[PDB]
C-alpha cells in the first residue's frame, strides 16, 4: 500500500457509525492535533476475537487521557455496523461503542494501508499509531486468527507521546 | 518490499554473530519447522532502547519452551555486532547473547522486509513472525525512537502456534 513509517498517513473519507449510533462522514485528517489508534478487523459478526473491539471501546477513557482516538474499521457496510452496535452483546454484539466504526465497502482503505488480503476481499488484523500531526508511527498486522492487545497499543502511543516531548 | 502476511518469508543469507561469540553465515530457511521470531534493530551501539536485544537474550529460555528461535538483525557489520556483545553491560554493551545477531551491510534484507529507512541506510525497528512453515504470520514496525515488548511477542507466537493446532 502507501502506509510508510515517518510519512503522512494515507488520508481516507468514509462513512462512520460514531459513539451516537449516527452515520457520518469523517476523515482521518480530522483527528490532527490528535494521536490515531486506527484499526481494522476482517468482518463484523465474526466469531474470531470480536471482543477486542469491545476492549478498545471499552477502555476509550484510557486513550482519552492520552489525547487519542481511536477508529476501528472493516469492508463491512456501516449498516452492518450499525446493526452489530444495536446487537447487545449478551446476544453476541458490540453494544454502544466509545469508538466510530469505519465503512471500507470500496477496499481502497484496506489497499492503502496495505492490509487487504486481495483472495478475499477482506483486511488483515491491521493497526496503525498517527501521531497528532499526521505522520505515520507504528504498523501492527496480525494474520486473521490473532487479535491486538489494548496494552500493548496504550505501551506503544505513550512510547510514542513521551519520545516527541525530546 | 517483499513481506505479505500468508505469504513465505523472504529468505536471507547473512553472517551472524553466534552466542558463542563466532560468526557463522545462516539463512532464515535454516530454521524450518520452527518458529522465528524475526527482529531489525536500528544501529549497534545505540542509546535508544538497545534494552529490547538484552531482554530478548535474557528471556531466550520462555522462546525455547515454544519451540521458536529469535533472530536480531542490523545494517552493521557483524565485527560491530561482536564488539557490542565483548562490551560489559555496566559500559554501554550488550554482554552475552543467547541469540543471534545478523548482519545486512547491503541493506537488503531490511528492503526486502520493507523496513529500510531509505534517507539513512538503518532498518526501522521491523519485528516479524514466521512460522515453522516459513510462511510470515506477523508484521510489527515501530519508528526508530520506540521498541518491543518480550511480552507481546511472546503473546503472538503462542497464540499463532495455538490457532494452528485448534480452529
Ligand atoms: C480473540 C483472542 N484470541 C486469543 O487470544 C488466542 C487464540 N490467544 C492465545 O492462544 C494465547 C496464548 S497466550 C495468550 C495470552 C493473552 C493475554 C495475556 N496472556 C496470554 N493468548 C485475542 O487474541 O484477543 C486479544
Request: net charge neutral.
Amino acid at each position: 500500500g502507501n502506509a510508510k513509517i515517518g510519512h503522512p498517513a494515507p488520508n481516507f473519507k468514509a462513512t462512520a457509525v460514531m459513539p451516537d449510533g449516527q452515520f457520518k462522514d469523517i476523515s482521518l485528517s480530522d483527528y490532527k492535533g490528535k494521536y490515531v489508534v486506527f484499526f481494522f478487523y476482517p468482518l463484523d459478526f465474526t466469531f474470531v476475537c470480536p471482543t477486542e473491539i469491545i476492549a478498545f471501546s471499552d477502555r476509550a477513557e484510557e486513550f482519552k487521557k492520552l489525547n487519542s482516538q481511536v477508529i476501528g474499521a472493516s469492508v463491512d457496510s456501516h449498516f452492518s455496523h450499525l446493526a452489530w452496535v444495536n446487537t447487545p452483546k449478551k446476544q453476541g454484539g458490540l453494544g454502544p461503542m466509545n469508538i466510530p466504526l469505519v465503512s471500507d465497502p470500496k477496499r481502497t482503505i484496506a489497499q492503502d494501508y496495505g492490509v487487504l488480503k486481495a483472495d478475499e476481499g477482506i483486511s488483515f488484523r491491521g493497526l496503525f499509531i498517527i501521531d497528532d500531526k499526521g505522520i505515520l508511527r507504528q504498523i501492527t498486522v496480525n494474520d486473521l486468527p490473532v487479535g491486538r492487545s489494548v496494552d500493548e497499543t496504550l505501551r506503544l502511543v505513550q512510547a510514542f507521546q513521551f519520545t516527541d516531548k525530546h
